[PDB]
Symmetry: C2
Subunit: 280 residues, 2 copies
């Protein structure tokens, strides 16, 4: 009944039934293609508790997407370094982006979310009014037509892929309204169960909370859908131990004032209450 | 157990646990958000048996996507009329597409799959060399880096939605290879369980057979993921009938000759064998 048991059963499923498969560096995983979990957002927030999730990084990363930034340095300056390797001088050069300033990830999530289809130049360019503001369209559609079956934000942009330091793993999400509740489903093409998945779940549940707040709805569910769901071979033992841990009740997420537009959210507007994860 | 039980069980879930939810024309549905099923493609083909599916329409429609057509007349001439309404004069004007000639669906699947990011003009334009050929990119990637986790074809194109007669319900699909077997997952944003979904399952099952044929792999799984999975209220009794039908074993799909490119498949290349469905039900 605790929502985290779905994630733990997913990990066990992969350990038991996954097939060996290599990633881009020729390093091994056990993998299963196609999974789905449902995390309730109703009076709790699914920030996993069997291993600590880096919540500060979740929140700052999302605010960074929302501002449309593609500069890794702009997130790093918040003390969140998770995108710094992908914007490093040597990683960019290895992709043939030698003309790029360091930190310049190319047209990744924030850019596609706010400017889909605009012509990417660099991370300093001013993209005001260019391309499709998918995030605002999502919000305005939820307000005016909550039954709509087309409420989609898609970061996957086949035309821009060669410019990206990484194609998005979070390929698209869809929102859904019924009974005054806003739900969201993510299609995640590639999921590292041990490192990334718990952070991605918290990311999209946060987005859902933020959008429900500004559209006057209550959070419903977050539906997590994976493509390549995998575990690195040198995470199997730490995971088998985490798999013995009983999850603690999920924390609550509180938004500390009335906020009117998605662009107006700041770190201080949020507070996670009663988060008690198991130790390292 | 029989792969079709998954579909029946999704229908049952929706009838029991779905919420009433109105659609575009305010006609009612029972709806659940988020569902997933896995249909084995290993020496069987998931063409539903509890009611007969329009196999001919599956095949022609898919062939029509592959050639990149956006012209509902070009599919109608095969006697498959499922797009004709969406390309009717009346439908097109209702959407404010006055300038557009009849049959011209705008930049829908065919065009996105073969020319994504191209400037659309009309259904008669020559788009050769324009945009991203995602379909060929998928096939070439499968051939050269089967471990790749980015093997995606996306019909959802935010830029082109305003020109489309209908944004795609089949938003994106991903391919996956392990152990010499090709799998496919479809993200389907909206699924009419009674009328649309059995047809949708066979369509993407068939695309996966075809890519597998071209790339020298064997069919693995089709993983069907749904957004708004719904049943129209006037399909509730016909579906209650269907639910009391036992599924008969799934047929096999045969490809009758060596085909080399995805563009070279034709209707005569395919044969469905052992397809013994319960009668039709109208909906």
């Amino acid at each position: 009944r605790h929502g985290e048991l779905q994630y733990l059963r997913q990990v066990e499923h992969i350990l038991r039934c996954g097939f060996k498969k290599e990633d881009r560096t020729g390093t091994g995983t056990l993998s299963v293609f196609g999974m789905q979990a449902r995390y309730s957002l109703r009076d709790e927030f699914p920030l996993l508790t069997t291993k600590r999730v880096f919540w500060k990084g979740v929140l700052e990363e999302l605010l960074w997407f929302i501002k449309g930034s593609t500069n890794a340095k702009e997130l790093s300056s918040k003390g969140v370094r998770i995108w710094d390797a992908n914007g490093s001088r040597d990683f960019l050069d290895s992709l043939g982006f030698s003309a790029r300033q360091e930190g310049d990830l190319g047209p990744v999530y924030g850019f596609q979310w706010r400017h889909f289809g605009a012509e990417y130049k660099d991370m300093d360019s001013d993209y005001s009014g260019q391309g499709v503001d998918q995030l605002q369209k999502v919000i305005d559609t939820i307000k005016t037509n909550p039954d709509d079956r087309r409420i989609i934000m898609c970061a996957w942009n086949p035309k821009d892929l060669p410019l990206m330091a990484l194609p998005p793993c979070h390929a698209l999400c869809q929102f859904y309204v019924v009974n005054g509740e806003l739900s969201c489903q993510l299609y995640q093409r590639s999921g590292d169960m041990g490192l990334g998945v718990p952070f991605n779940i918290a990311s999209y549940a946060l987005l859902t909370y933020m959008i429900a707040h500004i559209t006057g709805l209550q959070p419903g569910d977050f539906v997590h859908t994976l493509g390549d769901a995998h575990i690195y071979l040198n995470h199997i033992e730490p995971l088998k131990i985490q798999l013995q841990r009983e999850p603690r009740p999920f924390p609550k997420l509180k938004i500390l004032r009335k906020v009117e537009t998605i662009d107006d959210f700041k770190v201080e507007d949020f507070q996670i209450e009663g988060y008690n994860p198991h130790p390292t």
